[PDB]
């Protein structure tokens, strides 16, 4: 087997790749799609909730870590949850020692440092969770996407997960309004993005969508079926 | 297959590494001990005396442990030395803690627990050494125990371990009269067993290593048979064999 080079993260391919890292990268492609948008003063995280069966609740994909910073997970439940407790502990430690919120860029930098150790050292499996980070700090809203290759990017938007290329090309079609949009406009743009991800037979129902919005004065608040109801009342109809 | 580290279980349940540690004792020197009415002894084979060994030693296969504890060794030399040192440490730790010589059964169980711990876990090769402890205790007088690299043990009145051990023990049990041997008859029986089990027409006293344990005058004395004594015993058994064959 020529793929004896993908059994641990500590071996390189003959062509200079770490195939285990690439498999971890592709792992988050399995999870459900999730797209985020940010305005002049407001950043939104909208995700597509999934359920094991219709007789049970949908899997939460938007996680609250601190009043100003919020995360969205796509990938392994275990790794994402561990990253979430790590995020909460670090945000609290920052609030305790500096009395200031953890910067989005600094938080994502420590996330990268934490998740690089499994990539570099034998032992812990690489953190195979795609994280969408949306928060607020001195220069306004930020959207940070932390790829499971222990890499992160400052993005205007990103959709990570299953069939996320459709949302990616939707946002590629629709940059020109993201910067100047208000809450409702950006929310409807994100909903159209997920609807692009979602196939024809399915639609963004109340139980299907999860919306998280942060801003300058508005904390990272996550909406649910009853809470997403006013935001989806302004939503248009699917252009089918 | 299932011949990897000892912490494995064959589908039939066998511990193959422990099994090999068992059969490895068949490569060790032959040593036996038997229980007499008023005495106990250990007979051992000096398999390696080529020409130039200084014999700067008190006994090679037989190792003393305590004023009351003595054993014979059969296995790898390194594990042999480690086992003897741990035996001394445990026996004297018991003496210091309890101000009484350690019972033979208790010390035997201590060694067996260590040996099991060396095959129970840790990815360490089990001690490939089988021991024959000889000693006295006020609880059961004279006792002889046969250790085991597996970590088991047994109380025996006649037992041989080493090369050609199966035939030796078979004939030994064929010719054992329990409860009615003194030290002299026990010595004669051990010498005959050595005659039958060694690869020599006439075994030399140099190849033979005998230590006898006996309680008298309120104290237990452990002595290895001196060269004069062992040669006298072997010559007596030799003329006894001559008597047996001339009568035959």
């Amino acid at each position: 087997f020529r793929n004896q080079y993908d059994n641990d993260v500590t071996v390189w391919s003959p062509q200079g790749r770490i195939h285990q890292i690439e498999y971890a990268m592709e792992a988050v492609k399995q999870g459900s799609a999730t797209v985020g948008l940010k305005s002049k003063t407001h950043a939104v995280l909208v995700a597509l909730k999934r359920a094991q069966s219709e007789l049970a609740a949908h899997q939460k994909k938007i996680l609250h870590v601190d009043n100003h910073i919020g995360i969205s997970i796509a990938g392994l439940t275990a790794d994402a949850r561990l990253l979430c407790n790590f995020m909460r502990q670090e945000c609290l430690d920052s609030r305790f020692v500096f009395d200031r919120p953890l910067p989005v860029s600094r938080l994502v930098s420590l996330i990268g440092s934490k998740t690089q150790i499994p990539t570099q050292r034998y032992g812990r499996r690489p953190y195979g969770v795609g994280l969408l980070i949306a928060g607020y700090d001195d220069m306004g809203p930020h959207i940070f996407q932390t790829c499971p290759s222990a890499n992160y990017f400052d993005c205007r938007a990103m959709s990570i997960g299953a069939r996320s290329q459709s949302a990616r090309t939707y946002l590629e079609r629709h940059m020109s309004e993201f910067m100047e949009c208000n809450l409702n406009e950006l929310v409807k743009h994100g909903l159209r993005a997920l609807r692009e991800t979602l196939p024809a037979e399915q639609d963004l129902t109340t139980k299907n969508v999860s919306i998280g919005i942060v801003g300058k004065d508005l904390e990272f608040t996550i909406y649910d079926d009853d809470d997403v109801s006013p935001f989806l009342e302004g939503l248009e109809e699917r252009p089918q | 297959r299932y011949d990897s580290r000892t912490t494995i279980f064959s589908p039939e349940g066998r511990l193959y590494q422990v099994e090999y540690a068992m059969e490895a004792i068949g490569h060790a020197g032959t040593c036996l001990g038997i229980l007499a009415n008023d005495g106990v002894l250990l007979a051992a084979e000096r398999r390696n005396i080529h020409k130039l060994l200084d014999e700067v030693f008190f006994s090679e296969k037989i190792y003393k442990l305590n004023e009351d504890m003595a054993c014979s060794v059969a296995g790898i030399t390194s594990d042999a030395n480690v086992l003897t040192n741990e035996l001394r440490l445990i026996a004297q730790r018991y003496l210091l803690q309890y101000q009484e010589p350690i019972p033979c059964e208790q010390l035997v169980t201590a060694l067996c627990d260590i040996k099991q711990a060396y095959t129970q876990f840790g990815g360490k090769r089990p001690f490939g050494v089988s021991l024959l402890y000889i000693g006295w205790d006020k609880h059961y007088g004279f006792q002889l125990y046969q250790s085991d690299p597996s970590g088991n043990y047994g109380g025996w009145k006649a037992t041989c371990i080493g090369n050609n051990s199966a035939a030796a023990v078979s004939m030994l049990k064929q010719d054992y009269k329990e409860g009615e041997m003194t030290l002299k008859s026990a010595l004669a029986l051990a010498i005959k067993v050595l005659n039958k089990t060694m690869d020599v027409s006439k075994l030399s006293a140099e190849k033979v290593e005998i230590a006898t344990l006996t309680r008298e005058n309120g104290k237990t004395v452990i002595r290895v048979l001196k060269q004069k004594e062992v040669e006298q015993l072997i010559k007596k058994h030799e003329e006894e064999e001559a008597k047996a064959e001339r009568e035959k």
Binding site: - | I8, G13, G154
Partner: protein, 239 residues
């Protein structure tokens, strides 16, 4: 493949090392224990010592505390180690709570010890199954079986080791409420179950009886001949 790894699930969801250790008990020796109204009995097949073994140190049945006993099937070194650990834990439990250890507590400790020995590499599972017996403070007869998988279970009368299936079926067909009315009836049942597999009788069987806090004495080899005379007498009596 998936067999030579203690902590690796098989594709069909089996820890094959654990099941192999469990199967290692079936190569031990038959040990059957029955709990009665006021008695608990332990019947084990004794290896006939050839000519020289000292039967005093071939102990198959051992008591963990003055209120609990146990017989084992499996490798003797593992049984000795677990016996030492479990009686040490009984003493430490009496240190912590001052009251006699209940059978449930000691059985749970034994199961947890075996389990912690079968959840990591570099630690071979204890390949022994032990039948825990004893009376509680209120003198209720309880009997427990511990499995090398690290689990325990409450059995009214169970058998382990080789031929344990035959003894199990025998007990199923013969265990009655009236069969435990008297101590002698429980004894008759247990010797019958023993001779089901060890048909030689006489020797090669060891028995221990625990009544309501008598600090059990193993039945000595004078009334095993008497009790087997009784067994043979009842046996020619119904036939």
């Amino acid at each position: 493949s998936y067999d030579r790894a203690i902590t690796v699930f098989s594709p069909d969801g089996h820890l094959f090392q654990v099941e192999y250790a469990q199967e290692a008990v079936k190569k031990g020796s038959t040990a059957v224990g029955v709990r009665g109204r006021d008695i608990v009995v332990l019947g084990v097949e004794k290896k006939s010592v050839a000519k020289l073994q000292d039967e005093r140190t071939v102990r198959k049945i051992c008591a963990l505390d003055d209120n609990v006993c146990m017989a084992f099937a499996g490798l003797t070194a593992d049984a000795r180690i677990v016996i030492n650990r479990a009686r040490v834990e009984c003493q430490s439990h009496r240190l912590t709570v001052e009251d006699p250890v209940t059978v449930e507590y000691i059985t749970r400790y034994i199961a947890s010890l075996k389990q912690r020995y079968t959840q990591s590499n570099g630690r071979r599972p204890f390949g022994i199954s032990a039948l825990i017996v004893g009376f509680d403070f209120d003198g209720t007869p309880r009997l427990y079986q511990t499995d090398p998988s690290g689990t325990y279970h409450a059995w009214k009368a169970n058998a382990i080791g080789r031929g344990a299936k035959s003894v199990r079926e025998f007990l199923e067909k013969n265990y009655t409420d009236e069969a435990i009315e008297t101590d002698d009836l429980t004894i008759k049942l247990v010797i019958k179950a023993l001779l089901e597999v060890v048909q030689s009788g006489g020797k090669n069987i060891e028995l221990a009886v625990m009544r309501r806090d008598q600090s059990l004495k193993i039945l000595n080899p004078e009334e095993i001949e008497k009790y087997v005379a009784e067994i043979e007498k009842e046996k020619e009596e119904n036939e």
